[PDB]
Amino acid sequence: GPHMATGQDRVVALVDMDCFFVQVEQRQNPHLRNKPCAVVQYKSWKGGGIIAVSYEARAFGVTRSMWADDAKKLCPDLLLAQVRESRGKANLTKYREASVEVMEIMSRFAVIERASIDEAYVDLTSAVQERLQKLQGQPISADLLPSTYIEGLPQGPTTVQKEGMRKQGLFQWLDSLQIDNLTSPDLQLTVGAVIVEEMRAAIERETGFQCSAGISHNKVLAKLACGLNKPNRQTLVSHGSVPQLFSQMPIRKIRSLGGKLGASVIEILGIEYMGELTQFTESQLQSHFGEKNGSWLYAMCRGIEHDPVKPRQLPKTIGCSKNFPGKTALATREQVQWWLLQLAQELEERLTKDRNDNDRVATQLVVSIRVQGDKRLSSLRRCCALTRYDAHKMSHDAFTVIKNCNTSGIQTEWSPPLTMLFLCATKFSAS
Template structure:
């Protein structure tokens, strides 16, 4: 796990991208429960994207429109246009190109899908650190949408509470975690230090996401860590419109309760096979097996 700490990698994921595109086309949909459907109109079509307002009512991808409206009567449905019997994704691809164009100014980009991209921020982070003086200190306000995974434990649940109380508590925990992380950074600017490089990467991603929002109107979430798998993993921890920094020291505790299928490339048959053959459920358990045994059981490349 300690290999590759010199790298800074981010995964940026557009929040409910198809919904956002439809909301930009029709601003009346903003702030309302809505979903995007495609193909057959039978039973309202098949839902492929759901706004967070609709998710709160139990609407999920894969539902039919009619079924979803039973859970959320006010649900607004937007339909993907068709051309020659196929879904016409032109406006979504154009929106994606706009977003990727902004992101490419901040790092080396690798598109993962229409609404996701990886960025190698290693060089950009190192250059950022080269330009600062010794004794570099980051104001916590510059990391205003950043969570640092594993730095502080959530407070115990205090009754049911309402959504406002929950959001305020989460924001309090976020700020405390960021400040604790910044306080833990070495007093001198060691450009090779993985903690400082990740922090510089998080600053760059904050700037990039703000630029995407300002120039395109689209919101996105991000994960920042040392490789693609960890960046992908932490990107989904604090959506929407937030980013999560995952330092190497926080990975073991996160893995202790993380199902194997949640890891990139282990969500299908391979993950099921690993869990069955090794009689385990969590990534933390997989960590207990020596690399030689994994190579012997699953082949050198996969192991």
């Protein structure tokens, strides 16, 4: 009762760009706008692999990881943009740079944690408090929330179109707001949503890109909220909406529960939905999933999560990687050394840019490879000192640290063949 914390201390948002690489390509090429479109990587094998899909093309069933030749079977008018290729590999610079455009705009409103190339969490607690002093108990007009959904509303006893439903739920939400209570969690969320509308308007105004957002009390709910009404909309998930929302929410939809841990929860406990977790004690959950996971699950199924928005807008590693599938697996020493060089040359370019831009230098080089037949992402990881941003030195050091993995008795030959090379610069210090 009086002493049970409810996880309502923060306002946290997750902003995620809508079909991000497609929007980047559509900005650059007006002929792709308002069309079924996808961004494709390489070309020779089955037309290349799709990595981003416009919402018009999703309506035909086109998805990420689909081959372009297969996507065209679903959607014959599909337009395609190709990822740039440099040094024989995909080169993602255009998207990294568009990401920086978005992150710098968001960083004007609050401290952000970059969570992917296209999304960032926002700790809005301070901004909300400041905005709540300036408002001075004035009601929040629905005009301030033109793209906001209130999860769980409209409800109860009292319209057959999407936007009408949205507005009816928003009116019900606003009409129940205690606007005199500067500490009401629901009011704080609402003001947070007002700020995220402003943030998303600025992103769209200054970049042309549209995005979605979730606003809630923690990162997990904000991320979940964000996807509820993609694209080009934001969703507020209140603490009070959690029981109904979680009562039919598959466990795998919750961030970090999408893999083996979430599958074990389902299998060991005999449950399907996040809300069913409330029936177990914290000790029970810890007994099955370990001390940290059990505690985390106990709170999370009640909508409570305390992972902070870390103040970090820049990645902390800089890495280059390429897979060599099937018959293209690297099978000679010279092949391995040539591709390590291509990777090292792109890495040097990104590192040199990183040092001038962000006043830091990497100090460790991590070399990861995958051998043919191994289902793991990485078969082997070794590291060495990164002392000079010099591609030939880096590629040579990388070969040095992996070269003993070659079981071939022949010098020119590499065995077992390599299906992935990966160079990652890490352990940055200020410069």
